[PDB]
Amino acid sequence: GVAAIFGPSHSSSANAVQSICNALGVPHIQTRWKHQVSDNKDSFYVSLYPDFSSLSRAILDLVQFFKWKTVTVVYDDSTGLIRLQELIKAPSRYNLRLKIR
Amino acid sequence: THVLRFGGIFEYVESGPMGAEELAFRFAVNTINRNRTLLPNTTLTYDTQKINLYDSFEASKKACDQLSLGVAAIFGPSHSSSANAVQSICNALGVPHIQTRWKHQVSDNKDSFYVSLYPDFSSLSRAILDLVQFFKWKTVTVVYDDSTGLIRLQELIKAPSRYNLRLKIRQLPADTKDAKPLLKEMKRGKEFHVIFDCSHEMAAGILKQALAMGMMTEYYHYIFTTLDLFALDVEPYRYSGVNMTGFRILNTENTQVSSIIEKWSMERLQAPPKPDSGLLDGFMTTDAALMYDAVHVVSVAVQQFPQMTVSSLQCNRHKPWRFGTRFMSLIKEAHWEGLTGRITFNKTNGLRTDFDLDVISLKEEGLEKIGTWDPASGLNMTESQKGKPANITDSLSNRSLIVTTILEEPYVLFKKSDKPLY
Amino acid sequence: QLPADTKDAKPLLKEMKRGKEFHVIFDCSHEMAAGILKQALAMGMMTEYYH
Ligand SMILES: *[C@@H]1O[C@H](CO)[C@@H](O[C@@H]2O[C@H](CO)[C@@H](O[C@@H]3O[C@H](CO[C@H]4O[C@H](CO)[C@@H](O)[C@H](O)[C@@H]4O)[C@@H](O)[C@H](O[C@H]4O[C@H](CO)[C@@H](O)[C@H](O)[C@@H]4O)[C@@H]3O)[C@H](O)[C@H]2NC(C)=O)[C@H](O)[C@H]1NC(C)=O
Ligand SMILES: *[C@@H]1O[C@H](CO)[C@@H](O[C@@H]2O[C@H](CO)[C@@H](O)[C@H](O)[C@H]2NC(C)=O)[C@H](O)[C@H]1NC(C)=O
Ligand SMILES: *[C@@H]1O[C@H](CO)[C@@H](O)[C@H](O)[C@H]1NC(C)=O
Ligand SMILES: *[C@@H]1O[C@H](CO)[C@@H](O)[C@H](O)[C@H]1NC(C)=O
Ligand SMILES: *[C@@H]1O[C@H](CO)[C@@H](O)[C@H](O)[C@H]1NC(C)=O
């Protein structure tokens, strides 16, 4: 008998609890960013983490304030490319030249 | 031994025919049952159940439902969100979990009871990267479809750190196949070497917009990252002079491999028609082609192990299956010449990282092979294009004109320069 | 000249690509105007380089 699940803080584990919280009707508050699949037909969950959608606007506004041309984005895990997906798409419109390591 | 029940977890078509993978799983079981050469005194039985492909709670229950009456294997929920949940159940209960669809591997997975017969993109993204250097490109414009697509090409995004490629990564619009505002942007950048990463559904969806847009000329190359270009209608495209180069793994050249496919369309016999899609007859899509290879790899591992008696394992009272570790190594070090070439697994992983690819391309005679890729070897191109055998000529040149010249003063006298000269 | 009555003008349009012929002034009827441009789109010739 519980009222609010508070975010197991993984990407693998949080998806499994989310479908359970979907079915049972209990809410599922998250505090960590998660790769949300484009058609998981769920809204019984919040995620109180600043989204890397808007956080990538903040980086892209910042790197063209400093007028960089040779940015060298370096990640640490394969999930991180999704976290920076707006910055990876950035050379399509400006004169930035990425090089990802 | 006996019945040896397998377990199937498939999609929820909801008043249509059964799915292409579910037919493929039920075609392979029925074939090996009636072929007494492979697995002679056994008789396999399937157990297929239906899920929404997006509710892992349904995928977890139907796993523990199939584990309750007992299965010997789980042949994948075939979707990234649901497959990870059923992977964690099958590892905690011992039972292997044969996958056919590419999922995201989290780096700290710590899991061993899974094999995936889908060819992993870390082997594939090297093979795309070997074509973009065989074709000597410098400007490519990789286009993916959803946010997972960046992971599938991470060995292609890291590539300009060693070479001269200048990637221009773009994303398709969300779900609608109106990619005309994308293709208007791609014309104005003179982007001539697109490396699309759709499925074979959206590959037909783009090229009807990509032909309506004036972009199907001899100035455009299109590499696809699907394995189903062979089942794509190319009749409105064959004369355009375009270049559609892609990979097929389904070895339709062999007689025994091809003869299944007409028997496949014989057992299909309806193939729900959509002539305005831009697709051919079904032709055993690779999601179904691997499922027919999925049963045959498991059929080898039960052939060398007649000790499996499937018992009733619980879900909330988890206890590892008796021969779980023993039978899993029979899967992971197996070997079978199936539809898609030789089948091996990575002894660290269980992921197919050594296999065979055809490097089929688009000619005016149809869609034919021009080479063969091999993770060990590389591109073994059949570069001979003897439709027009004589191709180019070169130019005789400078030759430097060696002048026989002795030293005599004041003619060819040496210099008093205070260094060595060349 | 177009081939006699058949609307298979693809052997014509193969000859027209190799001459870089960019300013065609067709004199069909409105029936054969539709007949050519389905071959002229299947041939890679409907770009911004053709009038
Ligand atoms: C799955 O199983 C395989 C083999 O059983 C294990 O090994 C991986 O797969 C191959 C085989 O060894 C390796 O691929 C090679 O990678 C090279 C990368 O160069 C360097 O890259 C970084 C620096 O950027 C270094 O950290 C790294 O150590 C390398 O020194 C390629 O350059 C290699 O050369 C050829 O590649 C293709 C042909 O295959 C062509 O483009 C050229 O001919 C080129 O010369 C080669 O491809 C791979 O690196 C191995 N490791 C990994 C981690 O993938 C796997 O470990 C095993 N497990 C997994 C999870 O894959
Ligand atoms: C790209 O497409 C063009 C046209 O479709 C190919 O060029 C011709 O291909 C035919 C094959 O039937 C040959 O007979 C011709 O000699 C080719 N023409 C020239 C000028 O070479 C071309 O081969 C394709 N490129 C690749 C890499 O497949
Ligand atoms: C069964 O498999 C054997 C093994 O190669 C083969 O010789 C035989 O033709 C197969 N029979 C059928 C009906 O597929
Ligand atoms: C057939 O059954 C017999 C006895 O039941 C067994 O010894 C044999 O291994 C089985 N398989 C064959 C002959 O392939
Ligand atoms: C590529 O295939 C040809 C055809 O037999 C042959 O030269 C050889 O098998 C391959 N080449 C190399 C260098 O391995």
UniProtKB/Swiss-Prot annotation, chain A:
Belongs to the glutamate-gated ion channel (TC 1.A.10.1) family. GRIK2 subfamily. The chain holds residues 102 to 202 of 908 of the full protein. Ionotropic glutamate receptor that functions as a cation-permeable ligand-gated ion channel, gated by L-glutamate and the glutamatergic agonist kainic acid. L-glutamate acts as an excitatory neurotransmitter at many synapses in the central nervous system. Binding of the excitatory neurotransmitter L-glutamate induces a conformation change, leading to the opening of the cation channel, and thereby converts the chemical signal to an electrical impulse. The receptor then desensitizes rapidly and enters a transient inactive state, characterized by the presence of bound agonist. Independent of its ionotropic glutamate receptor activity, acts as a thermoreceptor conferring sensitivity to cold temperatures. Functions in dorsal root ganglion neurons. It comes from Rattus norvegicus. This is Glutamate receptor ionotropic, kainate 2. Homotetramer and heterotetramer with GRIK5. Tetramers may be formed by the dimerization of dimers. Assembles into a kainate-gated homomeric channel that does not bind AMPA. Can form functional heteromeric receptors with GRIK4 and GRIK5. Can form functional heteromeric receptors with GRIK3. Interacts with DLG4. Interacts with NETO2. Interacts (via C-terminus) with KLHL17 (via kelch repeats); the interaction targets GRIK2 for degradation via ubiquitin-proteasome pathway. Sumoylation mediates kainate receptor-mediated endocytosis and regulates synaptic transmission. Sumoylation is enhanced by PIAS3 and desumoylated by SENP1. Ubiquitinated. Ubiquitination regulates the GRIK2 levels at the synapse by leading kainate receptor degradation through proteasome. The postsynaptic actions of Glu are mediated by a variety of receptors that are named according to their selective agonists. This receptor binds domoate > kainate > quisqualate > glutamate. It does not bind AMPA without coexpression with GRIK5. It is found in: Cell membrane; Postsynaptic cell membrane. Highest expression is found in the olfactory lobe, piriform cortex, dentate gyrus, hippocampus, granular cell layer of the cerebellum, and in caudate-putamen.
